[PDB]
Symmetry: D2
Subunit: 354 residues, 4 copies
């Protein structure tokens, strides 16, 4: 037997109609009990299990999977989630860490990538799988992607030791701090542009063990509630004025991700470069990410953004850059020089160095 | 014979190394003369052609293609381009419109999608092909994509009547106001997520004629120099504070594209919704686009951004939304209500209406 | 209410383990009754429905879907299926045609593409959806693709009028005579290389109505049991000897699909060309298909296979070519010249005739 | 300076029209001289180079690339090529091995995958790049894929030590015994259903983790001893036992059976009797999937396994056939041993589980 905690935070997976729109819907465990793929009634009575705990049917090989449903309240559309919400999820995982072998987090799709990236950083030295999942269609609608996404998440967390925050959707397991949302309607809503999926499910389960991170059994779980809240993302657009950038980078902002053009370039007009230099003097740290979905930031042009307090984001997703920035800036008592060194390392498998 | 104007504005296609970095490089026509795929010397002498004009070798079918190279100065990395630069290109095309059968614009890749979208709107009633192209590797480096991208553009503009601003890269012709840049290194750098390519080149040339827009021969070319400059793009991110949005939307900003989450959703926290409402009262217009690459903005959630002065961008690329916003806000003497109605129409094939 | 017939012929979707291997498994309706996504017990009792008939829960819009399970016997691994088996399925659909609004056929994946193609031809003037589906993992294994494939098929047949033999797998509806199997393990096992999917399912259902064939209401359903059995497929490989081709094309073979190289080319060595000419003289008809997955057979090289009794397969899948060949050769009293003309037409949406300009 | 041999065997890359159809066209070096991307005239005169030898323009760093064009005769449409033709190419590479740092082979596309696979096996202990390339459109036609495919091949062979038979098309370098042709018209004609060994874009990315290691201690052994009596047989539904019997008659020594799905076939006894009968005669059978992607695996009662049947796992059919030809051509081995070799990864063509 392996035991999982299933943390239901909201999202379309469990929504219901009200006033002609989807809103978060309670009563998940009540529904899951009625579904044989999610709950084995025979086995429950045979072992007289606590009523709070569900049991998956037996799978082909391996151990049996039991899980407990923890329904947060209120439930949220993921568009409403913030660093504080992700911290609360991390703390749930921390409190219950020793009692469970893995975790699944039902989450809205709108910001799942940001959440996966955030939790990747908050959960330092993680030793157990934390699998985020969601759906484009609610589980109470007959024709949906929720059933198989939720089951897949539970089975992955239940059967494999992948000590990472991942995202499972549509038969694929992605490294969480490598995903981004590419489709607003299709079931294949997520993509991992600069890294292979960690796993694929088909006739057989294929796992890229060469990529999966190693359990650090000597080191304890350290949860970072100290995440800098004053970080932002700024997408450059052609002719963006210096005056607007000035306003954006005003105190109390401590860090910013600049999504630049192509291989990491921006306008070379002086008044704009002046504002970035000015913000560097105030102590602001800047990470340069590409607006492009695929590829890396690299030097090479006269228009490349580099210099005082600018760190290259290489091939990071913006969601990962923002989370890493929040993480590093939240660390206590470090020199700005040291903070920059950390931003330039691969801390959770989110960045590929050359 | 068909004659094209080749407008060289800059970009990696023609860059050179200097101080260990790529910068714009002059002298394109000088190089192209030396290349047999770009200039047929035999034919030039046989017709004693003007020295400014180049001739492509004969192609499989069709008419012969001649072209003239117009090298803008200064040349620019496309990261430095703005609405003003694209207006200048539109005006070049306007001045020379009657003398040429089509146009090719060599452009940097970093903002090509914005430029294509802008020109799409500026060139009202366009009757001739305007093909933007560029490269990930300069044409003076041996192993490059520039040669074939430039030749392809010239052949497409030279041989076909596609009255659209397009982008040609890597054997594909895209509708210009439908493209976006998806890869910063690969030769397949561009994608048209919510529309088929207009053409594909292989052994044969396949054109999606049932998508290509129809020539309106009665209507003259109207070039819009009146493009609103005070427009912006704002990407939402989780927990973006009201205070920051307030600062972003301060006068003199007239219009903004909000890149929202998923099917067009954002935080429902009241202080943020109050700033958008406040900006609507000041007269600002907002277009709601998805941060997602593929798919459409649609209502359906309690978190959907809709209401006063917010227009759904449906399946538009952000580059197209920004350009359309610039276009509509630059039109003279319209009510704010009318401006919104125009934003909700398909003006250049950039948006697909539901039905 | 719309009523469907669910024809369970076998395949991995319903297999069980025995001696460490998967074999066909009976008792489908018994399992489906226990599954709330497949059977609404409340509604069944509320309308006191016949015990043989299942009811899907209500869906977002549209009518309610009821269905009857017909479990063929014996059940088969699709690797064992032949023209005779597909004829039996066509005849089941014929007998029950008027009682039901659509059909779903649970079928093994190994030859689903051949079966879809065969049924496409056998069911002339079809007016109702016939949706084939299957799975890479059996429905009794917990982590599987069967649940969603079967539900999807039922919902597509139940809710839309697509008068075609289709294949539904992994959220996509393909034209059946356009599919081929491209992956032996992934759930995305099928691909339609020279045609778009007819439909895609996501948050919403998108249907390519511009491609879906039109119902011919005036014309009755004609089922062709007269399918020529003596047809074969022959894949060319470099240096394939004339002697081997000779042996392959011996009587009683009436038709063959030659899978050739690239744009439809083969060796020009004379002894080989002589065997094809010899077989043409015996009255054999040959269809030339490309080994390539995507693209078309076209003339252009000195190595292009063309001539006596050879018809270009253009962009047909080999599965479709073989079925069309079986269909056309089974038609009664036609000249060989006429048979060839029919092979060169688009009879069921399986072939795209080349564009002029 | 690095020197390459460019072996022009034929194919569309160099074809010309005649009687309204494409046929092989001679005079490649004559054309390439006139093209600045392919020949640097300044540099040629500056070093007074032999007239037979061409010089690519420089890149910034790295060495300069010179190459010699060897035009086979007659030139062939690849549809006409056989084991004998690929042996001849291997022997050209053997004779000139010491004089050149790499090789490029211009080849027709129709059977390039078979040829790449064959050469992969023939060229045991290969230490230098052998890059096959071709085109969907002839180089003399203005809008074509030939120019960039040929240049790419020369630059890859000239600049990198990838001791493998590869195929370069459309900005990608594939392991040769892993490719297959998926499109008959598009420039993206080939697919490796394994990662590409390299990709060319703004930068060149090479998957060094996959590229095989040079064995400098071991000499190049060229196998002319390739079994010719091997065949490929694609199963189709209801294929009769009588037809399979005829196909597997002597003198056939080996056959690749392209089976359904994960490696399955009809379980009807008369058919299984013919495969067993052929095994008794000494025939060896490799089971490959008709599917493009994935692996042959046991699991069903319909899986073809047993006497003298070896699983092809994830091999392409082109690789299975070539490996079968290779193994059967080896002298004095027991049939058991031949089967063990078929089940190993000999040239990177097969992934073991
Ligand atoms: N599909 C989803 O989950 C979208 C939903 N608005 C959410 O993020 O909560
Ligand atoms: N590939 C390119 O052209 C990049 C260049 N920085 C530009 O956009 O001008
Ligand atoms: N996935 C499957 O159904 C394969 C099985 N051998 C069959 O075709 O019956
Ligand atoms: N593209 C090509 O090269 C096709 C040609 N028929 C050949 O294989 O020789």
């Amino acid at each position: 037997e392996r035991h999982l905690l299933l943390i239901y935070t909201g999202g379309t997976l469990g929504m219901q109609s009200k006033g002609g729109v989807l809103v978060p819907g309670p009563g998940l465990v009540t529904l899951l009990r009625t579904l044989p793929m999610f709950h084995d009634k025979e086995f429950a009575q045979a072992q007289g299990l606590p009523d709070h705990a569900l049991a998956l049917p037996p799978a082909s090989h391996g151990p049996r999977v039991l899980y407990t449903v923890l329904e947060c309240q209120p439930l949220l559309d993921s568009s409403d989630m913030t660093i504080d919400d992700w911290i609360r999820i991390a703390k749930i995982i921390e409190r219950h860490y020793e009692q469970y072998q893995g975790f699944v987090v039902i989450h809205g799709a709108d910001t799942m990538a940001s959440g996966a990236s955030m939790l990747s950083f908050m959960l330092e030295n993680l030793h157990k799988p934390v699998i985020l999942t969601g759906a484009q269609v609610p589980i109470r609608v007959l024709w949906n992607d929720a059933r198989e996404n939720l089951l897949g998440a539970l089975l992955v967390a239940g059967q494999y030791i992948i000590p990472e925050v991942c995202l499972f959707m549509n038969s694929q397991l992605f490294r969480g701090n490598r995903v981004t949302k590419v489709d607003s309607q299709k079931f294949e809503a997520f993509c991992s542009p600069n890294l292979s999926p960690l796993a694929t499910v088909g006739a057989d389960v294929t796992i890229a063990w060469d990529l999966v991170r190693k359990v650090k059994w000597k080191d304890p779980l350290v949860v970072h509630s100290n995440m800098e809240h004053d970080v932002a993302l700024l997408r450059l657009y052609p002719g963006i004025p210096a005056s607007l950038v000035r306003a954006f980078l005003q105190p109390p902002l401590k860090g910013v991700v600049l999504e630049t053009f192509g291989s990491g370039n921006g306008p070379s007009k002086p008044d704009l470069l002046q504002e970035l230099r000015a913000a560097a003097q105030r102590g602001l740290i800047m990470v340069n990410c590409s607006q492009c979905l695929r590829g890396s930031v690299t030097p090479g042009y006269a228009t490349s953004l580099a210099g005082a307090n600018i760190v290259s984001g290489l091939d990071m997703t913006s969601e990962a850059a923002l989370a890493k920035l929040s993480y590093v800036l939240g660390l206590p008592e470090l020199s700005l020089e040291r903070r920059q060194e950390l931003l330039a390392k691969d801390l959770r498998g989110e960045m590929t160095l050359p």
